[PDB]
C-alpha cells in the first residue's frame, strides 16, 4: 500500500459467508436436517414396500 | 415349535391313564394303536424324524425306503435340482421336460429313466423295541391321554356304562387341549420367526425356493447402498 509499510498479505484471498463474527451457517447446513429426515422416512417406505 | 422334542417311551402315557380307575383295563397294545391314530390326526411335522436316502431309479421307478411316511422333497443326485410332481396321465408310456415324481406304495414313479435321486422324508422314531416314541411335552402327553380317555369313554357310552354328562366333559376337554397342542407345535420359535421374517421382507422377491431344498428360504435379503 502506498502509505502503510506494514500493510501486506499473501496471495490467498477469500471470505467466510457468516453472520456477525460467527461460524458460517451454510446452505447445506440449513438443509441437512431435512435431508437426514428424508433418509429416515424413505427407509420406512422401503421396508413397507418390501414386506 | 418353541420347546425341544425330548423323547419318552409309550408306557409313560399309561402312568397317567391308570390314575383314572375307569381306565384300568388299558394296555400297551391299546396305547400303541390310539397313539398312532392321535399322531396321525394331529399331523404335527415335528413329531417325525427327518431322513434323507439316495435311491436309484431303474426305469421311471424306484423302491422307496421301508420307514417312509411322508416325502419332504425328491431331488436329483447329480444336479441337486428338485422334482415337482407328476401331472402327466401317460408318463412312462410311449407313443408310436421338467422332471417329476409320483409315489403310491413302496414305489416312486419318476420322469427320469436311469438316475439316482435323493429323497428327504419323514419317519416315525422307534425304540430299542420296534415301537413308537412320543414327546415328553406335558401338553402333548395330556392331550394324548385325553384322546385315549375319549375313545375309551365313547365305547363305554355306547355300552351304557358312562353318563352322557361324563362323555360331554371328556369330549370338551379333549377339544380344548387338541387346539392348545396344535398351537404348541405349530407356532414358531424366535429362531423360526427370523427365517419367516427374512422370507416375508424381500424387496426383490425370491420365488424359486423349491429348486433348492428351501435352503435359502429364510436367508436375509441384502440391498447395496448407492
UniProtKB/Swiss-Prot annotation, chain A:
Cell compartments where the protein resides: Virion
Described by its record, this protein's role is as follows: Forms the portal vertex of the capsid. Probably involved in head assembly, genome packaging, tail attachment, and genome ejection.
Subunit annotation: Homododecamer. Interacts with the Cargo protein 1. Interacts with the major capsid protein.
Q: What is this protein called?
A: Portal protein
Natural source organism: Bacteroides phage crAss001
Lineage here is: Viruses, Duplodnaviria, Heunggongvirae, Uroviricota, Caudoviricetes
Q: Which residues of the parent chain are present?
A: 404 to 454 of 806
Swiss-Prot record, chain B:
Describe its function. Answer: Forms the tail multi-ring barrel with ring protein 2, ring protein 3 and ring protein 4.
GO terms under cellular component: virus tail
**Keyword Magnesium listed:** no
Name it: Ring protein 1
Pfam families per record: CrAss_Ring_1
Q: What else is known?
A: The barrel is composed of five stacked dodecameric ring structures. Podoviridae-like phages usually possess only one such ring. The tail is thus rather long.
Among its keywords, does the record have Ribonucleoprotein? no
Q: Give the main location.
A: virion
Q: Which UniProt keywords apply?
A: Viral tail protein, Virion
So which domain of life are we looking at?
Viruses
Q: Where would you find this protein in the cell?
A: Virion
Assembly behavior: Homododecamer.
Amino acid at each position: 500500500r502506498l502509505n502503510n509499510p506494514s500493510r501486506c498479505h499473501f496471495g490467498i484471498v477469500g471470505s467466510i459467508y457468516n453472520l456477525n463474527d460467527s461460524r458460517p451457517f451454510s446452505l447445506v447446513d440449513m438443509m441437512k436436517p431435512y435431508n437426514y429426515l428424508y433418509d429416515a422416512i424413505h427407509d420406512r417406505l422401503n421396508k413397507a414396500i418390501a414386506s | 415349535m418353541v420347546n425341544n422334542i425330548n423323547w419318552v417311551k409309550l408306557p409313560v402315557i399309561l402312568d397317567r391313564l391308570l390314575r383314572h380307575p375307569l381306565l384300568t383295563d388299558l394296555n400297551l397294545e391299546t396305547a400303541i394303536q390310539y397313539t398312532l391314530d392321535f399322531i396321525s390326526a394331529m399331523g404335527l411335522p415335528n413329531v417325525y424324524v427327518d431322513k434323507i436316502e439316495t435311491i436309484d431309479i431303474k426305469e421311471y421307478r424306484g423302491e422307496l425306503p421301508c420307514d417312509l411316511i411322508s416325502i419332504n422333497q425328491v431331488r436329483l443326485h447329480k444336479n441337486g435340482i428338485a422334482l415337482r410332481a407328476m401331472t402327466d396321465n401317460f408318463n412312462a408310456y410311449p407313443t408310436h421336460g421338467e422332471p417329476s415324481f409320483k409315489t403310491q406304495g413302496r414305489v416312486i414313479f419318476t420322469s427320469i429313466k436311469h438316475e439316482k435321486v435323493d429323497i428327504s422324508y419323514k419317519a416315525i422314531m422307534l425304540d430299542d423295541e420296534g415301537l413308537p416314541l412320543i414327546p415328553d411335552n406335558p401338553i402333548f402327553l395330556k392331550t394324548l391321554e385325553l384322546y385315549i380317555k375319549k375313545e375309551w369313554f365313547t365305547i363305554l357310552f355306547d355300552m351304557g356304562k358312562i353318563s352322557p354328562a361324563v362323555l360331554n366333559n371328556t369330549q370338551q376337554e379333549y377339544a380344548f387341549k387338541a387346539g392348545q397342542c396344535n398351537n404348541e407345535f405349530v407356532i414358531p420359535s424366535v429362531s423360526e420367526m427370523e427365517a419367516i421374517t427374512n422370507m416375508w421382507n424381500q424387496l426383490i422377491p425370491r420365488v424359486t425356493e423349491f429348486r433348492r431344498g428351501f435352503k435359502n428360504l429364510g436367508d436375509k435379503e441384502y440391498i447395496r447402498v448407492h
